[PDB]
Design a protein around this nucleic acid. Structure first.
Lengths: 170, 52, 108, 204, 174, 131, 128
RNA sequence: ACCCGCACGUAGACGUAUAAGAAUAGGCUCCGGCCUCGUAUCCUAGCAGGCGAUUCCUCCGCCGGCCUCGAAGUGGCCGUCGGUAAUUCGCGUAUUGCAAAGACACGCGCGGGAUCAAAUCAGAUUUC
RNA sequence: CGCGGGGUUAAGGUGCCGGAGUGGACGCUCAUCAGACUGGCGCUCAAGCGU
């Protein structure tokens, strides 16, 4: 580059560690109902739309049914159930659009005078709200078509007394 | 700098033994026995086995 | 009016540390999980996170609740006890205390 | 199978002393609150006179000076005998042992805050499962009778009053069983049976 | 002593120019594996015919499997036990489905009742009482009696040892 | 980017000090380590539950020896010429102004060290900020 | 109550039935299990009495020492599979096998249908 | 008990639900029958659980009356009021963006003043 | 026998103190202070003895 190395700083050797695609569990299929185990939507049943990369999953619990917005989650923090909802009608182009890894990203007088003040909680969007509605429309229609499933996705999962997760059949 | 087990690392085994790939490919570890009807055990051997 | 609890952890009891008879090693803790009474059942909770929750005396981040996080490493014995390692060793006054075995990392 | 409960009420009738004591001590050190009712009905294997003379050997251990400080205090109640049996197997010289022993409540008969609750039994210490039928056994309560306990007849009467109140519980409970079962049948008459075959296929 | 197996150990002296073609001594040894069978065979041929391991070799070591291990039968075993006082000869009956099982029971019985070791017992012979009435042990004759049928009272139910507390007192009518 | 060098993680095999045996009981005994020389001294015989003695196995890694938690090594400076010796070693060494340096000489050292890119451990010494 | 005898079928531990062919000792029996259901089948062999529970079904005339064909003929003649199907132990077993097979959605449907049935029993009890 | 001033909010809750006894060579019961198995029963839906409906008189909780509980003290019935998905919806739950300091009210306390009832040594001290 | 992390063992143990089985198969023993490959508590189809 521009500067001669001004100190005997050793460059790193070439690591032979390549990047290969993550292989998800056989239970992580598109449309599988997932139980979240951590976060602020902890214990809520959502629907997996697309499996992303490096363990991340694109999930959305139809906001109308359960208040879980179009979000990402690590696969090691979800339990895959045996129920798989049909995704026929949900636009895969819209799913692929929201699945890009940049959708969930983002000195003067006012800069000084805002120091020490609480940040304002941002309102959401006008296009992200429409994106949620676009995916939810067909998803909710399919979920209503499925018998009894809408009341299933609206109820939070919890452990009662005597229930052993090691002997269950999730 | 780091000893790698050839029984766990297949590349190290291929480095030390170039025959490992075609040993696994041609299944020389699951070789079958010679075909044909095997004969029966002689009666003398059986009367010797269950003696007094 | 939901009127229902929200528990997503298995209750556990921190029995003691890994030890012989006159030599105690606080770096590893022996924990009994409720419902786990065999090595095969203990094999399910291997790798799962464990939380020791306690109120101390004093609010720090708006609350008095502090938590020491750890992980189940291996089964112990034949009765379903597990060995667990925490960032720092668990307090010796928590011998016989309630710990929370979480359901993550999940391979289900 | 394995359960973590608020408090375990253990009905001490027909239980071996040492085996129930070991299970109770392990539970106390594990962090379980244990109360033991009917401590007079615990059983010791062998004969009367063997445990009798062993307990006289225990009373014979007396200090030379005044029995006020450091001497072996001889408590003649059966629950105190069970408490001694538990205490000998708990590290009482440490604070952990003190906490484990303070987690335990021993009682004679079934006290009023403990006759409203279900009483458990320990199959690993029951006399009918551990002792051979040809062997003999002695009762801790009548052992206490023959060493010097002064409170046996009294708990016998308030025990039989408790049994009379339990007979009241089951005439009320047979009554409750009548309307519960006939409500079950009258509900099966109006069972709208799609839910019925669904629950039958699902097991319930 | 563990999973004992009946081994047919054939062994002979080493062949010499003066004495070729030895006698091929064969013995049946109940041992857990082949190494014990060979060692016991030499221990016995050192005793009997005076050949040694250094001057002898093993012709063959074959497993003698039971012909009909699904049929219960009567075994009578003769044995010599070296006690503190001296050697004594005994004879005992066992109701087993295999000769191996009878010898295993024999070892357990003589360990329990007479405190006899593996090295202090010499199994003279193991025979099968094919004919009824050949059995002389009263316990075995009770089992061989006409139309046997006995109930099982006070049957302790197999409860879990990790189930600490039970709500209902158990019953022993099963 | 200005920090210390890239170094291997700093591992201290033991953080506590080796106290002299029975130095907590007697006020005439300083806590500086003295090797016990008695034959029946259980610290010297290394019985269980006793004091450990300093051994060469407790030594620090040669790549992180003498290194501060920031990653620099301490370099005692008495004047401005001494911080100038760290022109080519700004990432490996940090300036430690000596305890008997006056205030104005301390100001001279701190100013030059900032220009050279050398960290000063005791820059909050007998100086203050004027607006 | 029940006595061990030739023809006494007994449930072992694994949800299987085995008829006693001959009594070996006070603690062990020879038993053979010829059936068509793979779950109720049992290989012929020594069965310890401690690990077996006597079933009130009896083969009427089983000759002692009967080999697998005769025991299978008697088994099909009486209909031991059907009588094991009707008795309480297998109804409890089927209830347990169905109980362990509920998923999370099946458990939710069970609780909801139990709520409907429960409201209806509350109405039936409020009638009383 | 009041008047001024001052100070601070768990040897281990997360559904921490479940009462005869007596026997274990028998017990339960609807009188049909039942019993290895507490591997059971209840309860378990909604912003850490909202609004408006449709719709149900089911459940819970608070106060009064009638009685019940002494063993180391409690529950039932009726009545008032409030909430209440058994069924079906329209609304809000989001950027906390893949798990990691404001006001009011209620209490425990003090530092002085005097307010009752007492104790110790009319007059000195002390006690909720 | 240097300072640590992980794994596996020896001798000895797995009723509680005390980490780990009230593990399994076969028998024997009730001792008015049995016995313990017992230290205490305590144990008796053992927590004793032999395999």
């Amino acid at each position: 580059q521009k500067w001669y190395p001004a100190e005997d700083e050793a460059q790193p050797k070439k690591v032979r560690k390549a990047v290969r695609p993550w292989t998800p569990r056989k239970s992580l299929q598109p449309g599988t109902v997932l139980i979240l185990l951590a976060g602020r939507f902890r214990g809520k049943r959502v629907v997996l739309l697309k499996c992303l990369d490096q363990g991340v999953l694109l999930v959305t619990g139809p906001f109308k049914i359960n208040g879980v917005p179009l979000r990402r989650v690590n696969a090691r923090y979800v339990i895959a159930t045996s129920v798989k909802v049909d995704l026929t009608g949900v636009d895969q182009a819209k799913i692929d659009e929201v699945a890009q890894p940049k959708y969930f990203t983002a000195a003067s007088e006012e800069a000084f005078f805002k120091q020490g003040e609480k940040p304002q909680k941002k309102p959401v969007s006008s296009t992200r709200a429409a994106d949620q509605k676009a995916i939810d429309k067909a998803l909710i229609a399919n979920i209503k078509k499925v018998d009894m499933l809408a009341s299933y996705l609206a109820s939070s999962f919890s452990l009662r007394k005597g229930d052993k997760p090691h002997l269950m059949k999730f | 700098v780091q000893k790698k087990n050839p029984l766990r690392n297949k590349q190290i085994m291929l480095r030390l033994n170039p025959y490992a790939s075609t040993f696994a490919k041609e299944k020389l570890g699951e070789v079958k026995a010679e075909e044909g009807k095997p004969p029966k055990v002689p009666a003398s051997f059986k009367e010797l086995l269950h003696e007094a | 009016p939901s009127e229902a609890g929200h528990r997503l952890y298995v209750k556990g009891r921190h029995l003691s540390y890994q030890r012989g008879r006159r030599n105690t090693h606080p770096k590893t803790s022996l924990i009994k999980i409720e419902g786990v009474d065999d090595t095969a059942a203990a094999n399910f909770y291997l790798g799962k996170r464990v939380a020791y929750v306690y109120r101390a005396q004093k609010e720090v981040r708006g609350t008095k609740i502090r938590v020491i996080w750890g992980k189940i490493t291996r089964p112990h014995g034949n009765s379903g006890v597990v060995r667990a390692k925490f960032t720092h060793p668990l307090p010796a006054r928590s011998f016989g205390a309630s710990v929370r075995i979480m359901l993550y990392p999940s391979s289900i | 199978m394995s359960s973590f409960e608020s408090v375990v009420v253990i009905d001490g009738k027909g239980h071996l002393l040492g085996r129930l004591a070991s299970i109770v001590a392990k539970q106390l050190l594990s962090g379980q609150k244990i109360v033991v009712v009917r401590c007079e009905a615990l059983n010791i294997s062998g004969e009367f006179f063997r445990a009798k003379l062993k307990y006289h050997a225990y009373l014979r251990k007396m200090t030379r000076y005044n029995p006020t400080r450091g001497g072996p205090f001889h408590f003649r109640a059966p629950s105190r005998i069970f408490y001694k049996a538990v205490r000998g197997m708990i590290p009482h010289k440490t604070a952990r042992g003190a906490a484990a022993l303070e987690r335990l409540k021993v009682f004679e008969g079934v006290p009023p805050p403990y006759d409203k609750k279900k009483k458990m039994v320990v199959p690993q210490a029951l006399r009918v499962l551990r002792l051979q039928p040809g062997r003999k056994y002695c009762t801790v309560g009548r052992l206490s009778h023959e060493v010097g306990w002064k409170y046996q007849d009294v708990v016998a009467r308030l025990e039989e009053r408790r049994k009379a109140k339990g007979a009241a519980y089951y005439e009320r409970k047979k009554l409750a069983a009548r309307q519960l079962s006939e409500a079950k049948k009258a509900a099966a008459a109006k069972v709208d049976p799609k839910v019925s075959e669904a629950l039958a296929a699902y097991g319930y | 002593m563990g999973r004992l197996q009946e081994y047919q150990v054939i062994g002979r002296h080493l062949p010499t120019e003066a004495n070729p073609n030895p006698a091929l001594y064969r013995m049946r040894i109940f041992a857990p594996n082949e190494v014990v069978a060979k060692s016991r065979f030499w221990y016995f041929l050192r005793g009997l015919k005076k050949v040694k391991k250094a001057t002898g070799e093993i012709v063959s070591v074959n497993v003698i499997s039971e012909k009909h291990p699904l049929k219960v039968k009567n075994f009578g075993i003769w044995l010599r036990y070296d006690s503190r006082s001296g050697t004594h000869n005994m004879y005992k009956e066992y109701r087993e489905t295999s000769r191996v099982a009878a010898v295993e029971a024999m070892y357990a019985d003589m360990a329990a009742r007479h405190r006899a070791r593996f090295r202090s017992i010499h199994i003279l012979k193991v025979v099968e009482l094919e004919k009824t009435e050949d059995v002389k042990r009263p316990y075995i004759k009770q089992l061989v009696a006409k139309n046997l049928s006995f109930p099982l009272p006070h049957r302790v139910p197999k409860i879990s040892t990790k189930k600490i507390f039970s709500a209902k007192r158990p019953s022993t009518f099963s | 980017m200005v920090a210390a060098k890239k170094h291997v993680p700093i591992v201290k095999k033991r953080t506590k000090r080796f106290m002299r045996h029975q130095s907590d009981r007697f006020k005439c005994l300083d806590s500086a380590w003295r090797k016990p020389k008695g034959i029946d001294n259980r610290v010297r015989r290394r019985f269980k539950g006793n004091l450990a003695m300093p051994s060469i196995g407790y030594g620090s890694n040669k790549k992180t020896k003498h290194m501060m938690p920031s990653g620099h090594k301490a370099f005692l400076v008495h004047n401005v010429k001494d911080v100038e010796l760290l022109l080519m070693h700004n990432r490996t060494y940090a300036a430690e102004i000596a305890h008997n340096v006056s205030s104005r000489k301390r100001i001279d050292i701190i100013t030059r060290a900032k220009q050279l890119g050398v960290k000063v451990t005791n820059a909050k010494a007998k100086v203050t900020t004027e607006v | 109550w029940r006595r061990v005898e030739v023809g006494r079928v007994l449930k072992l531990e694994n949800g299987s039935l085995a008829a006693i062919v001959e009594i070996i000792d006070h603690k062990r029996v020879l038993a053979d299990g010829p059936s068509s259901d793979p779950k109720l089948a049992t290989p012929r062999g020594i069965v310890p009495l401690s690990r077996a529970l006597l079933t009130p079904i009896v083969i009427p005339k089983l000759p002692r020492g009967a080999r697998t064909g005769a025991v299978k003929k008697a088994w099909e003649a009486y209909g031991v599979d059907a009588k094991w199907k009707e008795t309480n132990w297998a109804k409890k077993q089927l209830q347990q096998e169905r109980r362990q097979s509920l998923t999370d959605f099946d458990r939710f449907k069970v609780m909801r249908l139990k709520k409907q049935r429960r409201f209806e029993e509350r109405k039936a009890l409020a009638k009383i």
